[PDB]
Symmetry: C3
Subunit: 336 residues, 3 copies
């Protein structure tokens, strides 16, 4: 498009919603290309990540780990106002894997406390994509402090299967998975620090072992379990977007499947089908489409089961509806 054509595009502000929920959007694009405007304030804050009171100095887009999911369509522009309050102590920026140029935007968005910036980029490629902070020389430290999320760039005509039939979800969730590297003292007790920088050297030592102390969904062990389980109903079509900005994961819906899975996260790459466990490499997002067929509690996990059940990477779905004995039945219940 020419300069006048770009300047003439409608601008639309969108209010964000905290994960695993997702802001208002249409699957099929509404009108022609738009400049979709988002604002996020960066928060540095101590968060508790497990049932033992373990603290991380989180660095959180919009105050959440992961940062919120931003949704646009192919050939829209995403225009982000990024704000770094004066109360923060570190410089931050943002790299969109969906974007082209300047390291994904990081080169143009380096903001000190008390600064803001506005970045626009054209969303040329459909898919789910990681975004993360990336201050030169301190990239993994910000990322593993929770400073990452994802965006979804929908095809203008919505999702389709590998044969071109439309796939329309009834709901969408965004599960961001976070590897944390929390230092311990010589007694094995997790350490606490006054300021984020105080933890830097000890944390890098743990990072270098390549062994996270915690692997969590939505910023904490059990954050998506119990009264915070995700929900669905038999017959409901759900899209589950999953990201991991730094480390591999292998999502699995225990009791279900990935009917269609864009394992690479990219909608122009045909989805795998009938998946038991899919694979998302560190630095990427993926998306799975499932139609629920049975009610009950499902577990949604990283299927390294030590990571899932010892280190924190397990969520639940609570699903309503009628049991289907054709699909599964207890012929003889546990009996002596």
């Amino acid at each position: 498009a020419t300069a006048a054509e770009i300047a003439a595009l409608p601008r639309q502000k969108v209010e964000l919603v905290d994960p695993p929920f997702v802001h208002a959007h249409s699957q099929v694009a509404e009108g022609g290309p738009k400049v979709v405007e988002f604002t996020m304030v960066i928060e540095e804050k101590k968060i508790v990540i497990d049932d033992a009171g373990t603290e991380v100095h989180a660095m959180a887009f919009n105050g959440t780990v992961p940062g919120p999911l931003m949704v646009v369509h192919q050939d829209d522009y995403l225009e982000l106002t990024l704000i770094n309050p004066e109360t923060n102590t570190l410089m931050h920026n943002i790299d969109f894997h969906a974007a082209t140029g300047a390291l994904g935007g990081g080169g143009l968005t380096e903001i000190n406390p008390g600064e803001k910036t506005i970045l626009r980029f054209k969303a040329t490629k459909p898919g789910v994509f990681v975004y993360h902070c990336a201050p030169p020389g301190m990239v993994p430290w910000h990322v593993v402090s929770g400073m990452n999320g994802a965006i979804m760039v929908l095809p203008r005509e919505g999702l389709h299967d590998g044969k071109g039939k439309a796939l329309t979800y009834d709901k969408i969730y965004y599960v961001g998975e976070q590897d944390f590297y929390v230092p311990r003292d010589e007694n094995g007790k997790y350490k606490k620090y006054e300021a984020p920088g105080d933890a830097y050297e000890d944390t890098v030592k743990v990072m270098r072992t390549l062994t996270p102390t915690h692997v969590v969904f939505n910023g904490a062990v059990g954050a998506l379990t119990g009264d915070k389980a995700m929900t669905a109903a038999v017959g409901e079509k759900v899209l589950i977007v999953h990201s991991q900005a730094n480390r591999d994961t292998r999502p699995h819906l225990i009791g279900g499947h990935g009917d269609y899975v864009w394992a690479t996260g990219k909608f122009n790459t045909p989805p795998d089908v009938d998946q038991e466990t899919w694979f998302i490499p560190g630095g990427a997002a993926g998306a799975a489409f499932y139609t629920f067929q049975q009610p009950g509690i499902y577990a949604y996990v990283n299927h390294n089961l030590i990571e899932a059940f010892e280190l924190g990477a397990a969520a639940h779905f609570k699903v309503t509806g009628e049991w289907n004995d054709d699909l599964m039945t207890s012929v003889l219940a546990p009996s002596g």
Copy 2:
């Protein structure tokens, strides 16, 4: 199908065999849907996993690690009778990744020592799928104690390539890959225990390092070598089913290739072709189809070579037949 309709279907009892062999089955389905009946007894036993006499307290479906391969066709019903003898000390169950509902069957199959259960599920999705024990709160412990296997759900019309051309194997082998986490004492010597519960706390500490002490095929270092090397002949078409219930693997046939590889293990996802090394995420099974073209010894490995050759993930094939000098020849043998 209605309860009445299911009750009218033919029943077929199958006799399971120990991996890497696979029970008798037909590639193309014989007739319409059947209820295919299997029985497995769970055995808690000591296994020796290396030539240093290192022991694991195995929890073994049908008495083997991995548990045996069960073969059915799409839209058959798999009806498993699972038995936990009074000689065992723990509760066990079974989760089939192929199944839909109740956490893959685990919620309906919890059996104490002295109990049995019968589970029926519809095999709706064609592929190879992991199955494993998953007692709530004790999931990875049972899985990494060897309590896992796989099933194959064949398309009713047998296997095909990505273009509908039939693929018919002459032999099939099932390689179950197992990560073990064996505790060591102060001198770096592996510990032995006189009950499974005695090993628990020490084992969990090792598991949390995410670093297995051993990574093995068929339950031990060297299991599938020598007296247990897999066999083929030049011209023979072989299907190698490979599973890993907890941890990623990257199978490779040294001296050969994966001509067709269902890396995700799902037959409706077209196979990759001409593969050197494929990738199976933890919590999944995959399958590779190869036609042998050269005689001699092949090594079949997880191609993290430290895992293969230091930790134990190496099998052999012995292949008979005529050498092909067109494919490969020593123009000058090693010499001055």
Copy 3:
């Protein structure tokens, strides 16, 4: 082909060049099948792998880590003269993942110091493929000492996308990624050894942790930066071949994408498209095609960002040309 027919084929002697560059070749095959001849001398040599002066006793095909990229076309014969000079101390050989039989050639190429051998194999399958040394009983040690590279077997008609359209690159680079396992003293400083053998036992200990101390491109931290940065221009089409003989990687062009990615490295397997981060399992090579659209500095990384920025797996591209404000623009530069 018969011995007589192979003897009748043209011979072409290629001069190898050091990575990341690739010897002169044609994308589309010139004429019929040929016997393409290469020579490599193995050098056991001390190399420095970081700015601190950390040493590795490398085992290097053609004196480089990685070994150089050999390029042939499908159904050519690759004829390698491999020389193990008398100045070396170990037996070495070569395993080509591209080849069929005798463990990829390793069974036929075991050469002691002072010996040479000539191996010929038919390049039957198009793709990029790892090659590596593999002396029985000493396999991972040679590989993680740098004794690996890759070859490219181009289709005779050059590259095409998934849908039959020709893809022609302007330039090609070969990034070999190496995991090193360097022993540390009680202060945590890297140890130096007088002879390669002195390092063996200490190195195997580190190898067993499955945690490399360094993960590097072209043999050292920062090897492909500064005046050794890779280069391109806006509009230029670049193929990046990436290998890892022992351990998984997840390549990512920061600021860019993988427009077409043969993640499995095999050209008959349709490429993934629009990739943010792709995945290459240990024991394989992959290839990505990208057309640059923005000038400036890019980082090409393994997107486990700890591995990239702490352990060494980061390269740079310097890209000339005109900035595209349609694709990305700073609407408001960092400001109060």
